[PDB]
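Run: sequence + copper (II) ion -> complex structure.
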Amino acid sequence: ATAAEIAALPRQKVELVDPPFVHAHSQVAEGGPKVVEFTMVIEEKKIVIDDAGTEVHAMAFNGTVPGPLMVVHQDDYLELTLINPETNTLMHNIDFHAATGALGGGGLTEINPGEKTILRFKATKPGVFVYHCAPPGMVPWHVVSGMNGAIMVLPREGLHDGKGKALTYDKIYYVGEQDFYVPRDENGKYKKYEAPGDAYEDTVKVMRTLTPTHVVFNGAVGALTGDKAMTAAVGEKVLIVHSQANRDTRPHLLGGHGDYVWATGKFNTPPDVDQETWFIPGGAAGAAFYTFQQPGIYAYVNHNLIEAFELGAAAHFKVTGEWNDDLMTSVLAPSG
Amino acid sequence: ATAAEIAALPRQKVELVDPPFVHAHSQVAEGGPKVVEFTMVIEEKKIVIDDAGTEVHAMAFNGTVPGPLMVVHQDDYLELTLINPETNTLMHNIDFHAATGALGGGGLTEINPGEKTILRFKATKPGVFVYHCAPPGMVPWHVVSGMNGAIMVLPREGLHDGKGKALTYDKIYYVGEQDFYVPRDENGKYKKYEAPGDAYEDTVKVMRTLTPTHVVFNGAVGALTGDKAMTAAVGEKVLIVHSQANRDTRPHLLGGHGDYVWATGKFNTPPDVDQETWFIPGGAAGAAFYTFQQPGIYAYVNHNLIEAFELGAAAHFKVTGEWNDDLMTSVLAPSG
Amino acid sequence: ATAAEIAALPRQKVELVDPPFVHAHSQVAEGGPKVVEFTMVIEEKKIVIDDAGTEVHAMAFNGTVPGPLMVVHQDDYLELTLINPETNTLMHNIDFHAATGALGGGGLTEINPGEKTILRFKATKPGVFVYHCAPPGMVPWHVVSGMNGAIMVLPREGLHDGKGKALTYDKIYYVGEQDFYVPRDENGKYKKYEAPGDAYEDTVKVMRTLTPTHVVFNGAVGALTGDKAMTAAVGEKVLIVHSQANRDTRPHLLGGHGDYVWATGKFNTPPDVDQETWFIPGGAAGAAFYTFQQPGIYAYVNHNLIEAFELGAAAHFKVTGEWNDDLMTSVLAPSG
Ligand SMILES: O=N[O-]
Ligand SMILES: O=N[O-]
Ligand SMILES: O=N[O-]
Ligand SMILES: [Cu+2]
Ligand SMILES: [Cu+2]
Ligand SMILES: [Cu+2]
Ligand SMILES: [Cu+2]
Ligand SMILES: [Cu+2]
Ligand SMILES: [Cu+2]
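>> structure
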């Protein structure tokens, strides 16, 4: 539309929330197109990713791994203020796979420590999409240091199944999956470094083996288990957005299914149904909709079970409610 | 359905057969919902997986790797009697990806050697699904020791293409693909052990490399070749069910195609057509329907050709019938 | 069709062109079925795959890696004269995934140095398909030495989207992706060999790690960059055919999307839409259709970013035209 029209659209600032939770939004669009404003400060910081105190010099959008989920509707504009504090040591930028032009915005957002930038793009295609830092010449290093997240561009009319029936979730979670490549010394002990750059050579060597030392959800082994398990109740409809900016994954809800799964993450592509295990290629996000039918603890994993149970890619859901014996029952409990 | 309603349903005892064959069943359901009964004894045994005499301590449902294919129809109940003999050394259980609740049943079927259990679940979703053992804390180890198989939940009305026309097969085969991680000594020779637990620590180290030493069909290199090549004839419609409980695979019928392929393995998701090579993610089963049009030997492989021809993921079909020169002909045979 | 009917069909001799370009063709078929004739000479030749001078003894159809794209229409016959010159040292053949019977033609085309053969097959299924050499017992070695390419069997009515609307491209490119497994010495430096056979044992060892040392487009790191970058203009419709005969890939156009993507490469399977990153399993070809909307440089990569930027799987597009600030604009350029 006209230049005047774009400048006249309402501007709305949104307060972000850390993963796996999601900021306030409406499934069906409220009002016409808007310029949705977000601000994220980049934090380079050491984080511990396992039970052995293993460290990673994370490069984190908004201070978290993965970066937070930004939600807008189709044809809204997303206007991001990206800040790189003088306390950081590296130049960073951002590539929105949802965006069109300039390497997803990467070519217009290269900010050195002490700089900020504001990028606006029209969210023309509906779906969940990965976003990640991509400084020319050091792209994978930043991505596998945790500098990635995802956004969801909801259709203005909300989600629908393959027959056009509405699919309205009761709650949504964002599971960002991260492959880490941590160097080890000759004794097999993970190495620690004073500054991010100090680990560059050692890390690229591990990266070239295409074999991550850790594969985790929400930045650490067990981050979404125990007292940090995600929750639901029998009868509740849940949308699980999942992304992996660098490597393939195959999500599976143990004890459940993906009733409707937009495996490619794009809402104009009809969702697959009754899925046991879906597939999200590296560089993409996907979304699965499920209505819980049984109470109890569920595991949500990357179904290469070595990656899930040896490398860290396992989360839990704690579900409340009444057990359904029609669906499943122990006719004879374990006995001699 | 109420407990009383379920108790009034007819019951049918099924006798399982060893893969790649499939037990007798009817594509279109005969009558209303029934409780289909199966029994499987778990056998921990040594299996030789290659011609170098390499051994794996298999944990096998029904004594085979993969475990047998169980076939029921949507909304039937599958009632499994699972037995863990006193001669075994480990606790085992079963998780049906087709089931809803208690980690697919794994949480209700933990049986120590000398125990048995009976689990019943309602097959609410149509398609092929993986089932596998998953003892808490030792999940991938059992799965990559061959303790996995699949089931097929047929629509009550049999299979149909994307437009609803019936698809009826003449033969069905079940190919279970297994990734094995066999430890080697300092001389690159595969190690042998006299107890399953003795190889645990050494196997976990190999598993962590995410690089299998072997990738095979039906438990061993060349299993489905020669005396075990699958058979068909020109004009015959064949359904090939393929599962991989832990790692991705990309099936391809050399010289043929996947006319209709439910790549996700779920029948309510329309099948892809005219496939050359399809993709099944670790933790899932898929199914391809093909009508043979040429006689001869066909290879059926995981199309990462190193995995097929160096690691063992190759099977054969021997097809009888008349050659079709319209489809293919050697205009000039190899000559000087 | 009878032998007489086929003999009566018109013949059209086609001159192949080197990738990423595609020989002249008509999207909508001109007239009725034809026997389309192609000729390719196999060349075993040394090629350099990176700036360091790393060598590979390639086995190349038509002298290039990948082999050239052959284009025909559904129900035409593809008649290939394949020549193995006496200057080569190995037997070679060709398996067309588009063909039906004799291992894709591999069983009828085994030619030793000094021999030739002519194979004809009916292109019964529409889509892009891989073709590759497959000598019994040496299959993956020939394929990962670059002996593979693809063909495109267009519907007689040209391409259409999933709802029947015509999709007509302005330009087409064929990107062949190759995984290489180059042996290294004790200093971690790539080895060079006098003869191709000298490298066999060392190469098979690297192949078994399932970890390529290089993953490239058009036979070498950076092959499709600089003066050889692909080109387009704002408003231009481009079809990008991508193949990988041995290993999975996940194409992504940085700054753009796959507006319509036949991820399975089969035209009778409706294309996915608005894709960020699509997935092509090893042993298959896929195709993406995109209308460029923004000018500038774009990267086209396999989105496992380590494979793209460390191993070589990255190409560039140079796009002319006017910048669209509605789609994207830098509200505040990087500043303090
Ligand atoms: O069903 N998850 O192993
Ligand atoms: O076409 N099978 O290599
Ligand atoms: O958007 N490619 O990193
Ligand atoms: Cu960064
Ligand atoms: Cu990207
Ligand atoms: Cu077990
Ligand atoms: Cu499972
Ligand atoms: Cu060859
Ligand atoms: Cu092939």
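>> summary
Chain C touches chain A at residues 211, 248, 250, 252, 254-257, 263, 272-279, 293-294, 296-299, 303-311, 323-324, 326-336 (CB under 8 Å). The longest helix of chain C spans residues 200-207.
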